[PDB]
Structure 1
Amino acid sequence: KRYEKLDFLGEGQFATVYKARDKNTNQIVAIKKIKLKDGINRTALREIKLLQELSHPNIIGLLDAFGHKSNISLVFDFMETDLEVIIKDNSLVLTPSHIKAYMLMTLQGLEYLHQHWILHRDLKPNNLLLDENGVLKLADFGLAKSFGSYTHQVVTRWYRAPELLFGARMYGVGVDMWAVGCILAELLLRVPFLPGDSDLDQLTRIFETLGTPTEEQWPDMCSLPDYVTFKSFPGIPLHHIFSAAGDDLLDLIQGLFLFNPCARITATQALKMKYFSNRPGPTPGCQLPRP
């Protein structure tokens, strides 16, 4: 097209991603070149249909789409970094203000997104792209879906909420909220909070670390279709897990890891929590660490 292909940024299941320049502007873009009698791949049509209806600073902008026949290339702005790389950077310190800023943008993007009746369903640190002005964008809307009208397989396992793991068809923002919870835990612990190798082992580590739920905690848990009773764990007190976390952040984390996804704080409720309004400012995007 009008695009120069600079760099292979990576490849995963549905697309190869290239850093590319339009022969039209100074602005670098990220072209996601989507791979194959189905017609144009649904994960591309998913990003096209959603990102054309979302206009928020904390959601990735679709710039263009082009292609030929059943192949397509979605063009997005290039994001220099992502939250996974920030979390994994061993020589980069996550001050509480950095953590608050990342969380704030994530929740603002999510609030907008949930207001527009969409779930990302694939929040994890690598899908939280940072532009070079330090605006975190939600990105990789390839699993994102409209709610308030699904499937349990969604969200990469370490961020997958227990209601997803118990086979919940229907869900709402709590799948994103638990994933925010997990991303928050990993901004704190600097490693996967619940790195479980299977649906069974993810539920085990959930119940090991946070305590096994009850019907006092999660009213109709037992009605989830892939439910099985775990042994009662005590859980590890959230101040023994997150010993740097203040009571406000633990109150956040607590509400982000509430077993009842109904009780689990929404992006709006989370944003109204005292954590965000308290004395350490959420860092300006300009001053977030570039890894």
Structure 2
Amino acid sequence: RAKRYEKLDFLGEGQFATVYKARDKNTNQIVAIKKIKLGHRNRTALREIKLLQELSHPNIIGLLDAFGHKSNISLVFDFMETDLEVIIKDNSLVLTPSHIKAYMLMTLQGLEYLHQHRILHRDLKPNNLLLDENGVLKLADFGLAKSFQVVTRWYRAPELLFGARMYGVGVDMWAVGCILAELLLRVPFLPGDSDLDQLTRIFETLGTPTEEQWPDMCSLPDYVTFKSFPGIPLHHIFSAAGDDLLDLIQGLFLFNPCARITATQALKMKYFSNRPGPTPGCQLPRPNC
């Protein structure tokens, strides 16, 4: 499983990881190796493989083989054609309501599954939702994921920005909300230049929160008193969205994290049972190469 795979294209440098297209020199499937190059620890990177092998799901990335002795450790995976991030930036593609319903659907079934199995994918962003031949979306980058201030600032839920130590599933949900806005607007919704500014963005956009809207807000370790903004109505931001969708977004971007709509609460919502339903993955937009 070391020399086994022959290197094709580069796919991504990373956080402490590189990713390569390679060809299994036996199966002849294209595969995506995650190199986790290291030194101290492979504690977090072993835990990853662990958490991974423990999951079977069509919207969860498929752990095929890990291997390798040296400075590095390799996780083999099914190759994927694009990520939801490129799918955004590709202008070629204009997005349809039923395209997004479809992208959201598969994301949240992935999520439902995960949180049933008591896990957090603490790093949900749109380059981490991959898509195959047949428009089947999959979560990935599990290097940040514990079994019940970590995401990349734009998709960081507030509680975290306010240095919450003990935090729940409402973390993953904030992200999914950020990803939906980003899907709608086709640009990062709340692109802070700093943690401090990421909160400014959140509040000025969504309004600064009450102790009603969020009790136990001030008890957070890094809590700090921002200016009080009113917020912006969602149908201003999303002149797009119909009321079934607005309802959903607004619930995902609730401030109180036990009052934040769970994956299931969200999958059990009109939006999904309402027309237009999800495009078949096979009929979902594909980009240039």
TM-score by length of 2: 0.95
SS of match in other structure, 2:218: helix
CA distance in 2, matches of 1:47, 1:276: 32
CA distance in 2, matches of 1:100, 1:130: 15
Give deviations 1:20-58, integer Å, cap 9, x for gaps: 11112232110112212xx66444323201110011111
CA distance in 1, matches of 2:213, 2:136: 36
Give deviations 1:219-269, integer Å, cap 9, x for gaps: 111111110111111101000001100111000000000001111110111
Contact 1:35–1:41, Cα closer than 8 Å, also in 2: no
SS of match in other structure, 1:255: helix
Contact 1:40–1:72, Cα closer than 8 Å, also in 2: no
CA RMSD of aligned residues (A): 1.2
Give deviations 1:174-195, integer Å, cap 9, x for gaps: 1110000000000011100000
CA distance in 1, matches of 2:160, 2:31: 34
Contact 1:177–1:256, Cα closer than 8 Å, also in 2: yes
SS of match in other structure, 1:119: coil
SS of match in other structure, 1:146: coil
Aligned to 1:4: 6
Aligned to 1:217: 213
The structural deviation recorded for 1:70 is 4.9
Q: Which runs of 5+ in 1 are unaligned?
A: 148-152
SS of match in other structure, 1:20: strand
The structural deviation recorded for 1:130 is 1.0
Contact 1:204–1:230, Cα closer than 8 Å, also in 2: yes
The structural deviation recorded for 1:161 is 0.6
User: Per the alignment, do residues 59 and 89 of structure 1 end up closer, same or farther by CA in structure 2, a change over 3 Å counting?
Assistant: same
Contact 1:60–1:139, Cα closer than 8 Å, also in 2: yes
CA distance in 2, matches of 1:46, 1:7: 27
SS of match in other structure, 1:145: coil
CA distance in 1, matches of 2:214, 2:100: 28
* The 10-residue stretch of structure 1 (20-29 or 135-144) with the greater mean CA deviation from structure 2: 20-29
User: Identity over aligned residues, as a percent?
Assistant: 99
CA distance in 2, matches of 1:128, 1:167: 26
Contact 2:37–2:71, Cα closer than 8 Å, also in 1: no
The structural deviation recorded for 1:203 is 0.4
Contact 1:79–1:131, Cα closer than 8 Å, also in 2: yes
Contact 1:34–1:41, Cα closer than 8 Å, also in 2: no
Contact 1:47–1:140, Cα closer than 8 Å, also in 2: no
Contact 1:46–1:143, Cα closer than 8 Å, also in 2: no
The structural deviation recorded for 1:285 is 1.1
Contact 1:4–1:23, Cα closer than 8 Å, also in 2: yes
CA distance in 2, matches of 1:52, 1:225: 35
CA distance in 1, matches of 2:157, 2:35: 30
The structural deviation recorded for 1:69 is 4.0
**Number of residue equivalences:** 284
The structural deviation recorded for 1:139 is 0.2
SS of match in other structure, 1:158: coil
Q: Which runs of 5+ in 2 are unaligned?
A: none
CA distance in 2, matches of 1:132, 1:168: 39
Contact 1:159–1:182, Cα closer than 8 Å, also in 2: yes
The structural deviation recorded for 1:91 is 2.2
Contact 1:14–1:43, Cα closer than 8 Å, also in 2: no
The structural deviation recorded for 1:199 is 1.1
Give deviations 1:45-78, integer Å, cap 9, x for gaps: 2320111001111110110011014521110111
The structural deviation recorded for 1:289 is 1.1
CA distance in 2, matches of 1:275, 1:46: 36
Aligned to 1:183: 179
**Equivalent residue in structure 2 for 1:27, among 20, 26, 29:** 29
Contact 1:211–1:233, Cα closer than 8 Å, also in 2: yes
TM-score by length of 1: 0.95
Contact 1:31–1:73, Cα closer than 8 Å, also in 2: yes
The structural deviation recorded for 1:94 is 1.2
CA distance in 1, matches of 2:90, 2:270: 29
